[PDB]
Ligand binder design. Sequence first.
Ligand SMILES: O=C(O)CCCCCCCCCCCBr
Ligand SMILES: O=C(O)CCCCCCCCCCCBr
Lengths: 162, 162
Amino acid sequence: LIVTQTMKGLDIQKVAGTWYSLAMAASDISLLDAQSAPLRVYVEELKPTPEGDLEILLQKWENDECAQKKIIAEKTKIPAVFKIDALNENKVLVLDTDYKKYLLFCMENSAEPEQSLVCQCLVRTPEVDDEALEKFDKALKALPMHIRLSFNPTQLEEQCHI
Amino acid sequence: LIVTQTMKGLDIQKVAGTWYSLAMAASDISLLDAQSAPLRVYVEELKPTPEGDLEILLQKWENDECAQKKIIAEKTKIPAVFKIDALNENKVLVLDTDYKKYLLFCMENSAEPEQSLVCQCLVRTPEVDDEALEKFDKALKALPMHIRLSFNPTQLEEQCHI
Ligand SMILES: O=C(O)CCCCCCCCCCCBr
Ligand SMILES: O=C(O)CCCCCCCCCCCBr
């Protein structure tokens, strides 16, 4: 309830497929700090289940290797909001998407939200889309972000972005 | 020669005194990555010498302590450009400043410049100046930055920003 942008009319079937985490931003430097930072995750594929949920395939640097994790984001009453399971009451929110190029989303804890806010700009191809990054910065100016990372084409094609 | 912004009529005597590194940005994530990242420096004081040079007092996390270093930036033919000494031919450039509130500067190697570009937004008081941060982002949009850090008032008052 910090993000004032949510997408009207989200057809989660159309956001299916391959995605690249072009940019990331968090309210805390320690969330995206190093490669092993807790919320430094790279999205691989989004798979909506027929029930209406969302299977997320991502890569995260855990041990000293690029691990592949599979998270499930269950639907709620609001079509643009999903819930992930743990002691952390995390909510994923889709802010904007044209389905064919980009998708902007934020993640936050429902109790300690502001120290959990982490947002990303996902794009379909391994290219630097300026239009998408502009929109991402636009949605970010109203939020308390303290770190912003951006990756280049070469890094987008590597496991865990090198 | 990547930064297209330099300040006309820089009176380096007026930029004397106390300064806080409110925001930092680099062309490489590894330059500002962790607290011990090579170019993660926090400006304390700027002291212009009568000869026209510039003594820079900064803090950098070296060992496992917040160290205080003293660098000298010698003047060149252009009043807004200074040179620091090492095997690295680094040039400091002052892009804009109103002397009383903020100062924007970038640093780069004259041979491997783009992988050396690191810029900062310095402000006089430990407050989040929106006007200064807007100007900083404006000067940054034309440059290849891949990481952007920002600090809050509480961190600005701590050695090495906590
Ligand atoms: O295993 C972990 O600790 C990391 C969990 C990271 C949560 C990432 C959620 C990504 C959701 C993307 C939704 C795209 Br609509
Ligand atoms: O000792 C080191 O290795 C770090 C050198 C860092 C160079 C910092 C230069 C800061 C210049 C500020 C100028 C303000 Br006009």
